[PDB]
Curated annotation (Swiss-Prot), chains A, B:
The lineage of its organism: Bacteria, Pseudomonadati, Pseudomonadota, Alphaproteobacteria, Hyphomicrobiales. Its EC number is 2.6.1.1, 2.6.1.79. One of its GO terms (cellular component) is cytoplasm. This is Aspartate/prephenate aminotransferase. It comes from the Bacteria. SUPFAM superfamilies: PLP-dependent transferases. L-aspartate binds at residues 38, 124, 174, 374. Its cofactor is pyridoxal 5'-phosphate. Its main location: cytoplasm. The record marks 11 as: Important for prephenate aminotransferase activity. It is found in: Cytoplasm.
Length: 399, 399
């Protein structure tokens, strides 16, 4: 037909559908609280704004090298050494239009029909969509809430086959907020060292959003033996409240970086020049924003964890990173919502919650693990408190 | 293998190669004049820069709708009506990270194995690279310099087969600077009306760079019968000297725009927010920059054409738009260059010109039609004059 056969491999997005239903409820006058934000509710710090404005003033308005301006590729190589104790040259780095484009082109540069990509559940839904669009086969490995949504080494090992090309490792996790300690990650790298053909795609986007005394670690830092088959991907979107600017980056083996540069050159050429100069300042400038926001987010996390565990039938683990919680609604399965609807799935729970209380969350089965739902607490404490009060009232009314 | 088989369908780029030898020669201390620019030498106009700075100041730093902020999509729909007398709603528009991403995802959203894409030669080198990467088959149809590189209806009709899905229409053209009059375009749309399965991808990027009394016309304006199978693509890169900002756009039928949006959502999630607000001002603001640059560029064109036609063995047509000339070196084929090397191909002419005179151009066979070479006159008149003198000296020394 006219559209590519490949598009049929991509399942419709439950997350966009939730945003759409919420938007429809607000349009007809309902008081809706959205709990699906994927971006901080803070503006970009002034120092980053000023650097962008400076680049505009100087006339940095021309095409950049496809893989990034040299100032930013250098800043990225230094960040990987300074923050993650990894050794990359600037030539091993690539700047994309979002971390999204890094992941997309890593897959488009590598996937052939029959290639498998191991994706732990719950997963960010864009991961299997990209793999499927690029023609690969997602292979999902479920985690369990009793293990705080973290992968068991034995489950990772069973999922790997000679057809496995990639293992996607996202810590801290969207949607669960789970974050692997050094020792938890070492158990997984020990498995990967037993399957040397499997490349590792590590999504470190939420590196700087971690709570308490948790210490972030990335796969090649934990296992240097993974250096020649890992793409270490990160970005400024979450850490620096720069989601709109679209700057992500990665570092890895030269032959992969060259292949992604070739595809990126056909797709977008380099990322917006002004946004790249902004990202240079984000990485090289003062880092006070990071510490300030850890405290703000930890308080929001604590509020939501406290309130959700008071709700009838709800159980909420305490996450260690990112700004998501992944509570279970297992205690409400089989009960009758206020509307009369029998709650048979987490999708029923979430759609009844939205209609009855105007609180918009995403059901866990959309991310590969239920009966659960995701809440993003990247919004005000007043809105979180009001939304959790409504969730408490809704759950108490289920019979 | 680890890298995707699709990558092997893309031939290595001669445009990057020549840019490599020029950079290398410059490193050895040669005074190189580069005539392979693809971007205005002027900076982004101040009104656009100010709009960008305003957007930064007030915090337009969040994720946008994937297809673009509503202000820009509305500005695009209004531009297509005001400037091209086309009727599109804002829902029919899509904003991408460069015109490249518009073109790339038009193909990625549609191409299946065996789908053919008719590309007139000389062609922008990225067109067949995109088609091949996405699995399509480029089908080249040569034009003649005697027609100033404008396709004849009979030639278009002979290249269309039942497998043709796309016809790529780039006017004014990179590399040739040819621009089809309304009359000349009607000859091709008359053919396209007889082949209803062929969609039209019209790349109007150089719309606002035309000379003399020429009046730009776009296919759907010429033939409204093509409305339901054309993607009308354009951008701010060339007209507003915004190459580094990466904003391109298109309008077309909703079923294609929605497919392109789905793919763009997986790739970038939407263009840099600050750059979208700059492009709002580009389209809606004063257009004095366009008119000013027509005069400046026309004078550069006249200078380059006249000097090239004084170079021995060179024949330079007068382009109607863009900022390229596509002179023939047919008169030098078989002569011996100053080095003593016999010029067999235009690739030989171009590499000898670079090595002997330090002038960097791109050989015509890279664009599918020779013996020719492309010169960009988006550079100062002093540099064009000096480069053309060197070319004259080189050509005179060919025996
Ligand atoms: C886990 C994860 N990876 C990658 C991304 C991409 O972030 P961006 O493309 O905005 O830089 C996100 C954003 O939603 C994310 O949550």
């Amino acid at each position: 037909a006219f559209l590519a056969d490949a598009l049929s491999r991509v399942k419709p997005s439950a997350t966009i559908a939730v945003s759409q239903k919420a938007r429809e409820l607000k349009a007809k006058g309902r008081d809706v609280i959205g709990l699906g934000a994927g971006e901080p509710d803070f503006d970009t710090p002034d120092n980053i704004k000023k650097a962008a404005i400076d680049a505009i003033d100087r006339g940095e308005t021309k095409y950049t090298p496809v893989s990034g301006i040299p100032e930013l590729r250098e800043a990225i190589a230094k960040k990987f050494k300074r923050e993650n104790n990894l050794d990359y040259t600037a030539a091993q780095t690539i700047v994309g239009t979002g971390g999204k484009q890094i992941l997309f082109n890593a897959f488009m540069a590598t996937l052939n029909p029959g290639d498998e990509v191991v994706i732990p559940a719950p997963y960010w839904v864009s991961y299997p969509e990209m793999v499927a669009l690029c023609g690969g086969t997602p292979v999902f490995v479920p985690t369990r809430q009793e293990n705080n949504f973290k992968l068991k080494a034995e489950d990772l090992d069973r999922a790997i086959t000679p057809k496995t090309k990639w293992f996607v490792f996202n810590s801290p996790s969207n949607p669960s907020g789970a974050a692997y300690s050094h020792e938890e990650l070492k158990a997984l790298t020990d498995v990967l060292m037993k399957h040397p053909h499997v490349w590792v795609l590590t999504d470190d986007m939420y590196e700087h959003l971690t709570y308490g005394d948790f210490r972030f670690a990335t796969p090649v830092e934990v296992e240097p033996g993974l250096y020649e088959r890992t793409l270490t991907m990160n970005g400024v979107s979450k850490a620096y409240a720069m989601t709109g600017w679209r700057i992500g980056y990665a570092a890895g083996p030269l032959h992969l970086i060259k292949a992604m540069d070739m595809i990126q050159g056909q797709q977008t050429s380099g990322a917006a020049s002004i946004a790249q100069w902004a990202a240079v300042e984000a990485l090289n400038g003062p880092q006070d924003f990071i510490g300030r926001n850890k405290e703000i987010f930890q308080g929001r996390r604590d509020l939501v964890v406290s309130m959700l565990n008071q709700a009838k039938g709800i159980s909420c683990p305490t996450p260690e990173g990112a700004f998501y919680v992944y509570p279970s609604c297992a205690g409400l399965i089989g009960k009758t919502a206020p509307s009369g609807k029998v709650i048979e799935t987490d999708e029923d729970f979430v759609s009844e919650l939205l209609e009855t209380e105007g609180v918009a969350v995403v059901h866990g089965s959309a991310f590969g693990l239920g009966p659960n739902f995701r809440i993003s607490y990247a919004t005000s404490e007043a809105l979180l408190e009001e939304a959790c009060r409504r969730i408490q009232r809704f759950c108490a009314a289920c019979r």
